[PDB]
């Protein structure tokens, strides 16, 4: 058995360096040589209590890509589930019992862990409030690996909302289980990387620094992970001032090295200008596409004792 066979996928915290590496290596393998019957005669629950189109379709494609079927829902709007009095626990007990694996997304944190204690079948946390979204981080790791040929010894920059951006936190956390990545944090003072993430980085012996601008670090960077600067944590006057510093244009990448790739977990709105799309560094759309293969590999490894590739 591979280390993930029959395991629940709840948090990036409980996935080791070795497991991450195997997941990305498996994504790469599956993308090169699809295995369209791996999940033959397997039925996969895909229960999105909270809408996530890009994620949901990403998963549903992966399942069906491997020969599996899909049951479930896409927003708890339509569902009659967990209405007035009924526990999520009960709901999961019933629906997981229909199926061979249980992909869920939920607005309450801890909801994938609870699921895993009431499903007799492996559960994949498609997202649980502000807590975890492992497959996003996994698709982000894969895309790095795909374009840098490794995950150790990389110069990664993170831009935008680093205080509340959960996708950067888990990614920094994942990469920090590998060797000698130096992180570069470019964000408003008011959205600096949080104190506790930084301690974890010290404890994982991993250099980080703060920079004022994107353009500053571009020539010494391999991966530029862009996130959105949301106006909620500011007002109008603040945003309109603080936004300008953290928008990525074609002009910003003029001194990029060739292997530079621009990532964004999407959606973008104006934090990456249109004119970056055609530049050789843009990889956000490929990143989105790599969501399918990342989720293929996880589903595969979870349900198949071996990948007889």
């Amino acid at each position: 058995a591979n280390p993930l066979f029959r395991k629940h996928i709840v948090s990036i915290n409980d996935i080791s360096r070795n497991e991450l590496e195997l997941i990305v290596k498996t994504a790469a393998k599956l993308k090169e040589q699809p295995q369209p019957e791996l999940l033959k005669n397997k039925v996969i629950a895909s229960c999105f209590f909270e809408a996530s189109t890009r994620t949901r379709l990403s998963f549903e494609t992966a399942i069906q890509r491997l020969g599996g079927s899909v049951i479930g829902f896409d927003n708890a709007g339509n569902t009659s589930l967990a209405k007035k009095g009924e526990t999520l626990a009960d709901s999961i007990s019933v629906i997981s019992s229909y199926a061979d694996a249980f992909v869920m997304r939920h607005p309450q944190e801890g909801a994938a862990r609870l699921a895993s204690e009431f499903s007799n079948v492996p559960v994949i946390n498609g997202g649980d409030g502000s807590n975890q979204h492992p497959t996003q981080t996994l698709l982000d790791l894969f895309s790095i690996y795909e374009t840098q040929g490794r995950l150790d010894n990389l110069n990664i920059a993170f831009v935008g909302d680093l205080k509340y951006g959960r996708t950067v936190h888990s990614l920094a956390q994942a990469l920090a289980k590998f060797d000698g990545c130096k992180f570069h944090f470019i964000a408003p003072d008011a959205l600096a990387m949080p104190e506790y993430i930084c301690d974890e980085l010290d404890e994982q012996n991993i250099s980080y620094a703060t920079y004022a601008s994107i353009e500053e670090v571009v020539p010494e960077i391999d991966v530029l992970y862009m996130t959105r600067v949301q106006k909620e944590r500011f007002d109008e006057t603040e945003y309109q001032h603080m936004k300008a510093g953290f928008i990525l244009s074609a002009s910003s990448l003029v001194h990029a090295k060739p292997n530079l790739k621009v990532l964004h977990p999407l959606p973008r709105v104006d934090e990456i200008a249109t004119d970056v799309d055609k530049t050789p560094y843009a990889y956000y759309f490929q990143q989105a596409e790599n969501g399918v293969y990342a989720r293929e590999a996880l589903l595969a490894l979870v349900l198949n004792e071996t990948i007889g590739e």
Binding site: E236, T237, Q240, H241
Partner: protein, 125 residues
């Protein structure tokens, strides 16, 4: 009159934003040399001259009366910017509505007459 020392690329913006091409009177423009504008048979105060200062920070404004210079206005930042720039505040009432944009000029900042928020001179352009 004739406006000299205009930055190349911001000079086109003057013609548009100030509708200088509107009268019957002849108007001439040269781009890159710096941009430049000449305006045949029209008057302008030292007051109204300053509206321009926002776009061309250090620009000479000479005047023809009788085939040669008579006066040479140099521009300062005025108190007001009546309908030149839209307000960067998306929520501002100014937007869909039949009113003229307007900012007081205050660290060189622009303060919306309407929403009363305050923006850096650059963010307005």
């Amino acid at each position: 009159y004739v406006i000299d020392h205009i930055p190349s690329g911001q000079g086109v913006k003057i013609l548009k934003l100030f509708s200088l091409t509107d009268t019957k009177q002849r108007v001439t423009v040269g781009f890159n040399l710096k941009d430049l504008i000449k305006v045949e048979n029209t008057e302008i105060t030292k007051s109204q001259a300053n509206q321009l200062a926002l776009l061309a920070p250090n620009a000479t404004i000479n005047i023809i009366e009788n085939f040669k210079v008579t006066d040479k206005h140099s521009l300062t930042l005025p108190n007001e910017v009546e309908n030149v720039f839209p307000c960067p505040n998306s929520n501002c009432i100014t937007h869909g509505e039949p009113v003229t944009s307007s900012f007081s000029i205050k660290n060189i900042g622009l303060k919306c007459k309407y929403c009363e928020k305050t923006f850096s001179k650059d963010i307005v352009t």
